């Protein structure tokens, strides 16, 4: 049967980028041509593979990661990028093999009074390794005094809200991102394009 890409692209609610969702796709037939021409996409970039070649290839597993960031940050969802999102929220490896797809979601994820439910990790001591997910909410220590779980001076909550309002400039508007990763192990393949 068909691979459930629509459950990812057509999901009514998306995850915050710090707690990005991952859908493991296996043992199915994938129709990529219909998937990529469904909705209009503002960002469509593939790395290491052509999007028209996927209908010929087989992979052990395909991962569909999805989250929401703002417009000025879509450029960070790419191999070799740095920044608050790429370092502390969602990191792609330098040899990333897959496609990054994004579209404007101002109508869905912005509110008149501001939608503060979408968060991102603002403070972290070290960078994330590729495909790492950190959902910790421990108080960040920015000084020499330990925080002991109490916010204060040099003691910050690590997450920060976006606050999406539909009249903001496109750089501040929310964008839903879907990252397709194509893993090729020395195991029998389960996802072939057709």
């Amino acid at each position, epitope marked *: 049967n068909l691979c459930p890409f629509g459950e990812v692209f057509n999901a009514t609610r998306f995850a915050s980028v710090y707690a990005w969702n991952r859908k493991r796709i296996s043992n199915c037939v994938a129709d990529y*041509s219909v998937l*990529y*021409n469904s909705a209009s996409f503002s960002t*469509f*970039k*593939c*790395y*290491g*593979v*052509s*999007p*028209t*070649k996927l209908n010929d*290839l087989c992979f052990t597993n395909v991962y569909a990661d999805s989250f929401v960031i703002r417009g000025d940050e879509v450029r960070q969802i790419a*191999p*070799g990028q740095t920044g608050t999102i790429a370092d502390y929220n969602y990191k792609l490896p*330098d*040899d990333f093999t897959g496609c990054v797809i994004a579209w404007n979601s101002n109508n869905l994820d912005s509110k008149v009074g501001g939608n503060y439910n979408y968060l991102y990790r603002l403070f972290r001591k070290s960078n994330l390794k590729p495909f790492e997910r950190d959902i910790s909410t421990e108080i960040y220590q920015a000084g020499s005094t330990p925080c002991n779980g109490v916010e204060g001076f040099n003691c910050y909550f690590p997450l920060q809200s976006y606050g999406f309002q539909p009249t903001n400039g496109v750089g501040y508007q929310p964008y839903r991102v879907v990252v397709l990763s194509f893993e090729l192990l020395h195991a029998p393949a389960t996802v072939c394009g057709k």
Partner: antibody, heavy 121, light 109 residues
Framework: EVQLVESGGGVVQPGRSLRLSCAAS????????MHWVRQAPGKGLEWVAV????????YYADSVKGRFTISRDNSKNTLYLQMNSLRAEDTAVYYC??????????????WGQGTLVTVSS | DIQMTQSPSSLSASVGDRVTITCRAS??????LNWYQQKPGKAPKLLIY???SLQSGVPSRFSGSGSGTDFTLTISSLQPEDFATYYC??????????FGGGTKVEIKR
């Protein structure tokens, strides 16, 4: 023996439209992806757009997105590039290129002789 | 975009010399680096694809090598018809294909 012949180039005023063609021959045209690549006078090469074998999937460079349109007619073995809202920066020799098809990624193995598009009032 | 920097911008060599052209990438492109040759007033022609695979019909005196961010095109024995401009082009970012600046091989006299 792979041939590509372009046509439809010439002069055009800014903001107008122009359509290019690319007649292919001596290969299975309905199975390979196709490309358009331009070259400004005295400058280098710039990839423009790509279209799938069946013509269902199209991808464009940011310098021409929402401004150019790529299409193909597999029954006539011809590739098209509708160029609308032409700016002076679009003045270049336009090539069509067949995709190699031996890799997971795109690459051009055969090119057309090229036709000139001069955008000026 | 991924910038491709070729070195040198120009060189002068004679028939029979060994010419090596360098192509650098702003980030790792694995082995997806293609070489092209272009004559003045003519269309480009594919020489090397996937860094080292020789295209059918291209003479064996052409050879490519390298990986990651540094790549090299080598003409073991330069022939009179090989004087042209040689471009490298990365295909790692498949929907943002970019070319190098080019290296014009000229005649030393």
């Amino acid at each position: 023996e792979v041939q590509l012949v372009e046509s439809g180039g010439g002069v055009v005023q800014p903001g107008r439209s122009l359509r290019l063609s690319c007649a292919a021959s001596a290969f299975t045209f309905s199975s390979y992806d196709m490309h358009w690549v331009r070259q400004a006078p005295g400058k280098g090469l710039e990839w423009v757009a790509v279209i799938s074998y069946d013509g269902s999937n199209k991808y464009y460079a940011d310098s021409v997105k929402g401004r150019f349109t790529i299409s193909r007619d597999n029954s006539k073995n011809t590739l098209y590039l509708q160029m609308n809202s032409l700016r002076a920066e679009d003045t270049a020799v336009y090539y069509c290129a067949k995709d190699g098809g031996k890799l997971w990624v795109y690459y051009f193995d055969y090119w057309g002789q090229g036709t000139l598009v001069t955008v000026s009032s | 975009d991924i910038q491709m920097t070729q070195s040198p911008s120009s060189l002068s060599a004679s028939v029979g010399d060994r010419v090596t052209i360098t192509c650098r990438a702003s980030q790792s492109i694995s082995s997806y680096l293609n070489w092209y040759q272009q004559k003045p007033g003519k269309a480009p022609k594919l020489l090397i694809y996937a860094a080292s695979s020789l295209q059918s019909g291209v003479p064996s005196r052409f050879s490519g090598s390298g990986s990651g961010t540094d790549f090299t095109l080598t003409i073991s024995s330069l022939q009179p018809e090989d004087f042209a401009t040689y471009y490298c082009q990365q295909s790692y970012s498949t929907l943002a294909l970019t070319f190098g600046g080019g290296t014009k091989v000229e005649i030393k006299r």
